[PDB]
Design a protein around this nucleic acid. Structure first.
Ligand SMILES: Nc1ncnc2c1ncn2[C@@H]1O[C@H](COP(=O)(O)OP(=O)(O)O)[C@@H](O)[C@H]1O
Ligand SMILES: Nc1ncnc2c1ncn2[C@@H]1O[C@H](COP(=O)(O)OP(=O)(O)O)[C@@H](O)[C@H]1O
Ligand SMILES: [Zn+2]
Lengths: 629, 97, 318
DNA sequence: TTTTTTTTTTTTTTTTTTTTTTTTTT
DNA sequence: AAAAAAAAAAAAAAAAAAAAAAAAAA
């Protein structure tokens, strides 16, 4: 049989690259193969820059230009390397291996795709707009002769169902009538994703171009719709298999539901002559096959302590030790604003959160803190929302009036590509286990105010219309910003008269914060000076005790704790509830206030990294409740 | 034959659901009703389809589930515990109690 | 059918920038037909450059776009002014706000016509990224689409979550709008709010608001009619220098602030506080840094802050 | 304010017929 | 040379009924 000579040189060069690189002598690729052996992985990663220094690019350019023809030899050399250095990775519980290339020198756009790079190794960038299911693809087929019962195996398939031709025994004469052994055959994961051009590469007036990218193996589901991803792989061409004689009658010679373009009728150049085609004409289209994908656009203490490094672990425990830590944390929140320390403390308590409990009877007790901040304009109420949405994970930002049909809770819309009713997501739904920052909270629609009557307390949304019936989930905290009715706060009317919310909605907010500015000669100078110290030095203007990352780590570490209540804490709690109820006189104070006080005490306890609750914490929570009523 | 979509609670917020086909044999027909939420134990199988290979352009296969067991979960939050296919059914000693 | 500037262009740009009064020349060049209304042209010339833009890690991005709203009596020449500034700017869109889709200025997931597929089409605010977006007939824009502009002028990003796609785009544009009142005249006695039919926050968030007035004055009427008829009678304005100068100032130049600006700015804000919200000072800073980009410089001084405060107080006068 | 009013939005193809003209198959 | 079998060839679309929203008013 005819063999290749350049392929052999590439095969030995790849083996030498794998065995010899060692540049960090660490044997980085042998380290990777050992890591695969211990972790039972099925894909290897090869960097282009690492290969870009051996043979002065003679191997790298040879691989890049003719990746399609050189891949079989690369895998063959990898098999020998694996056998020589790690036989355990030669068999499964054989592992079909994959090679992933990345860090290519130059990137291409979708509009640079020409037929003269077919078969070459490229990298492309685009925004994903559709993904499909993970279907199984037939890789190594196995059949049995109908008469002999002889078994054939490892029948390669390119683009269509291919059965063998000659029986294993030349004594048998059989051209067809095989039976696939679906159990013995090997399968692989398969996914098709649709991408389009980026917003900047699109010209002033353009209909965006599209492409079909094929993800296979371990690369499935790594690209999600709406994201911006950089793919790398080989540019291939895909024929029309329907006119290549598919076995079944199901294709029925290109059955169609829509009319094809008359403009390209006869203009699309189709080749004829082949015996399999018959008198038909074969057509081609360009698609992409990707091997590597990148994106360019747990409250358990024991497992948490494992991930962090030793320096981080010691720094965290030294941070915990000091007793002033609490006073520091309220200063680290939003270091780009002046004043409003109470707002910072409230935001920190909200981010820390409270414990969620379930009773034996099955009723759920809420553990989310809701905050409402009101005041007259130009009081930096909208800076806190931006800080939270930038710093808090799984947080969303929204306004009172929403343009979307599912404004804040949910909507029912028919399937765009299916025969069922689906459910869209509102801002409340998109914030499960997260903070929702609502701005201009006054101008909400009444059908939404009544709808939020369930999300704030039961943390669910329940709809029942013609199409679908469901009980959705909204376990989200709410940080709301509102303006007084009439334009300006009045310092003799209460919160109720100045605000517009009803007693149902008003009683579901854990904390109310009224922030007021005053026009005096001296404070205005300080505020102006502070706001203008920026815009000359962007970084040295503000200096907090802790950076963003230290605070982000401390919050995650503190949320692992779950405090309990002591014996005297319960007595102090009931005494304070009784005193508050007496002082109210039942119009504004209910059981929900006691539950909120419990939540605030638990959050304050989480702040100090203590697993027991002291009556001082209940006193602090009581003071915080009294300050807002 | 029935089609099972993913439950809205299970689906990540804002993503499209997925669906699969389930074959119900004798003694299991008409147990599940259109609109209910169900849990099915079964066998996951594959089969060759000409149209699927023709449209996609690769030798991909179709999948389907042959149902073995059916459990209703419409309105049930006690699924956290309990054992069996129906927690509202009783045994002889339970009736005697 | 039907960038890469040369060194000689650089030299001529420098020598023209060395002019004694660059402000007034391009004040008159942008709208040759418009007579008087020099102050609105001053504001538009300052807008077309924009203050410097910055995004530091801790505080986050701070805006550097100037928003201008023109309103007043119904038969002035604001629409021609907008169509003038449309052409000068490199990348911009001129679409009226009378109707169209509620997300017509942002992304709208639509079914493709040629193929039964899905295409994500951006709107007019996204398509004006890095430039000036002109809105006409601002008063007819619907109550539901207005909120979209609210997220554009506050966070400069638009998020779309439909058909399984959840993503965010970038607006980063500047809004110049023109509106009309209710009735045939803007009576000065009644305040602005009733006539313009616009929410107080939307009017407030505009950096500069100009009132165009038309009073029956013999001198003004005769002078207007005279040059109008002279234009109809058949018998110092650069053609494309503005576009190249704008590109040079927008793509290479980034000014800074010095303590000379500190001393004037703080005391000016305090003196204005002798009902000026904190928005006012961040409006003065943007205008001063945009003026600094003009009369080509690399740092702000007293002249820029004086011009900015003069402009923002002449705006207050109306 | 809660009533009436209003646009509007997928809903569509699963089926047919006996000739007439092609490939296999004794 | 003379049989038995097997597909192509569809195309098409307005006109009406029911249900949920997003603007109007006694
Ligand atoms: N430390 C501060 N104190 C008061 N105002 C500030 C401070 N820092 C920034 N600001 C101003 O507050 C504005 C934030 O918007 P904001 O007043 O919250 O809008 P709204 O009141 O409509 O929600 C910024 O434009 C900024 O100019
Ligand atoms: N100051 C002015 N200079 C020149 N032409 C003017 C002036 N004021 C009004 N006009 C004339 O009046 C007309 C104004 O129309 P336009 O302003 O476009 O309508 P709209 O009021 O809808 O913006 C123009 O045709 C213009 O010739
Ligand atoms: Zn055989």
């Amino acid at each position: 049989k005819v063999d290749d000579v350049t392929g052999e040189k590439v095969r030995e060069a790849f083996e030498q690259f794998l065995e010899d690189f060692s540049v960090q002598v660490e044997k980085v690729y042998r380290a990777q193969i050992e890591f695969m052996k211990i972790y039972d992985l099925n894909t290897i990663y090869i960097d282009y820059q690492h290969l870009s220094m051996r043979e002065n690019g003679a191997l790298a350019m040879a691989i890049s230009e003719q990746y399609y023809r050189f891949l079989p030899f690369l895998q063959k050399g990898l098999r020998r390397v694996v056998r020589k250095y790690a036989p355990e990775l030669l068999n499964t519980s054989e592992r079909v291996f994959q090679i992933s290339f990345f860090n290519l020198p130059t990137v291409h756009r979708i509009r640079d795709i020409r037929s003269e790079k077919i078969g070459s190794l490229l990298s492309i960038s685009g925004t994903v707009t559709r993904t499909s299911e993970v279907r199984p693809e037939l890789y190594k087929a196995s059949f049995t002769c109908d008469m002999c019962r002889a078994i054939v195996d490892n029948v390669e398939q390119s683009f269509k169902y291919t059965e063998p031709t000659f029986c294993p025994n030349p004594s048998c004469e059989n051209r067809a009538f095989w039976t696939l052994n679906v159990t013995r055959s090997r399968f692989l994961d398969w996914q098709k994703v649709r991408i389009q051009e980026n917003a900047n590469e699109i010209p002033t007036g353009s209909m965006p171009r599209t492409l079909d990218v094929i993800l296979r193996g371990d690369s499935v589901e790594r690209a999600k719709p709406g994201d911006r991803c950089k793919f790398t792989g080989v540019e291939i061409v895909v024929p029309d298999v329907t006119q290549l004689g598919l076995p079944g009658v199901k294709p029925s010679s290109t059955l169609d539901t829509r009319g094809i373009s008359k403009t390209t009728e006869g203009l699309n150049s189709g080749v004829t002559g082949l015996r399999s085609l018959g008198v038909r004409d074969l057509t081609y289209k360009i698609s992409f096959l990707a091997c590597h994908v990148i994106s360019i656009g747990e409250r358990d203490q024991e497992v948490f302590l494992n991930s962090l490094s030793s320096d981080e672990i010691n720094e965290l425990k030294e941070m915990v030790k000091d007793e002033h830590i609490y006073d520091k944390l309220v200063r680290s929140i939003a270091p780009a604003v002046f004043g409003h320390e109470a707002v910072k403390k409230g935001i920190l308590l909200q981010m820390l959160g409270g414990v969620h409990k379930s009773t034996v009877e099955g009723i759920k007790l809420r553990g989310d803190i809701n905050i409402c901040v009101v005041g007259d304009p130009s009081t930096s109420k909208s800076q806190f929302l931006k800080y939270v949405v930038g710093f808090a994970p799984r947080s969303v930002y929204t306004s009172g009036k929403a343009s979307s049909a599912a404004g804040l809770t949910a909507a029912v819309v028919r399937d765009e590509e299916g025969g069922d009713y689906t459910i869209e997501a509102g801002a409340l739904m998109l914030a499960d286990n997260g903070i929702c920052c609502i701005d201009e909270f006054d101008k909400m629609d009444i059908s939404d105010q009544v709808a939020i009557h369930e999300a704030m307390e039961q943390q669910t949304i329940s709809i029942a219309k013609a199409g679908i019936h469901a009980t959705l989930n909204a376990r989200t905290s709410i940080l709301a910003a509102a303006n007084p009715v009439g334009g300006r706060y009045n310092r003799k009317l209460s919160l109720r008269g100045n605000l517009n919310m009803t007693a149902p909605i008003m009683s579901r907010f854990d904390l109310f914060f009224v922030i007021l500015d005053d026009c005096n000669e001296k404070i205005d100078t300080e505020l102006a000076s502070h706001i203008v110290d920026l815009h000359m030095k962007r970084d040295e203007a503000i200096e907090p005790p802790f950076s963003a990352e230290q605070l982000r780590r401390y919050i995650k570490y503190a949320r692992t704790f779950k405090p309990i209540l002591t014996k005297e804490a319960r007595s102090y709690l009931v005494e304070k509830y009784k005193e508050l109820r007496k002082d109210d006189a039942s119009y504004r104070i209910t059981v929900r206030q006691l539950e909120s006080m419990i939540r605030l005490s638990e959050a304050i306890a989480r702040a100090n990294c203590v697993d027991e609750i002291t009556p001082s914490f209940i006193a602090e929570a009581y003071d915080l409740l009294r300050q807002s009523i | 034959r029935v089609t099972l979509q993913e439950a809205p609670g299970t689906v990540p917020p804002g993503r499209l659901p997925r669906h699969r086909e389930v074959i119900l044999l004798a003694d299991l027909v008409d147990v599940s009703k259109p609109g209910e939420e169900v849990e099915v134990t079964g066998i996951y199988k594959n089969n060759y389809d000409g149209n699927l290979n023709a449209k996609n352009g690769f030798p991909v296969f179709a999948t389907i589930i042959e149902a073995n067991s059916i459990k209703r979960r419409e309105g049930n939050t006690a699924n956290e515990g309990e054992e069996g296919l129906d927690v509202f059914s009783w045994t002889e000693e339970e009736e005697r109690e | 059918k039907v960038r890469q500037i040369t060194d000689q262009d650089l030299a001529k740009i420098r020598e023209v920038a060395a002019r004694e009064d660059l402000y007034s020349l391009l004040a008159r060049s942008i709208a040759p037909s418009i007579y008087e209304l020099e102050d609105v042209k001053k504001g538009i010339l300052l807008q077309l450059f924009g203050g410097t833009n910055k995004t530091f890690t801790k505080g986050g991005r701070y805006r550097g776009d100037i928003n201008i709203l023109l309103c007043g009596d119904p038969s002035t020449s604001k629409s021609q002014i907008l169509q003038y500034v449309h052409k000068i700017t490199p990348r911009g869109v001129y679409t009226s706000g009378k109707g169209s889709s509620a997300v017509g200025l942002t992304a709208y997931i639509t079914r493709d016509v040629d193929t039964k597929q899905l295409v994500l089409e951006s709107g007019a605010l996204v398509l004006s990224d890095g430039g000036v977006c002109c809105i006409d007939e601002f008063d007819k824009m619907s109550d539901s689409t207005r909120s979209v502009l609210h997220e554009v002028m506050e966070q400069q990003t638009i998020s779309i979550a439909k058909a399984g796609i959840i993503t965010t785009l970038n607006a980063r544009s500047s809004i110049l709008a023109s509106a009309n009142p209710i009735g045939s005249r803007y009576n000065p006695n009644l305040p602005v709010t009733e006539n313009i039919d616009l929410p107080p926050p939307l009017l407030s968030r505009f950096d500069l608001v100009y009132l165009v007035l038309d009073k029956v004055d013999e001198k003004n009427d005769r002078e207007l009619a005279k040059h109008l008829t002279n234009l109809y009678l058949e018998d110092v304005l650069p053609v494309e220098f503005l576009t190249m100068y704008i590109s040079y100032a927008k793509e290479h130049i980034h000014p800074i602030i010095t303590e000379a600006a500190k001393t004037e700015l703080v005391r000016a804000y305090v003196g204005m506080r002798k009902t000026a919200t904190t928005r006012q000072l961040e409006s003065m800073i943007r205008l001063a840094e945009a003026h600094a980009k003009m009369k080509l410089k690399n740092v702000v001084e007293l002249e820029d802050v004086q011009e900015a405060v003069r402009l923002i107080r002449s705006a207050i006068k109306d």
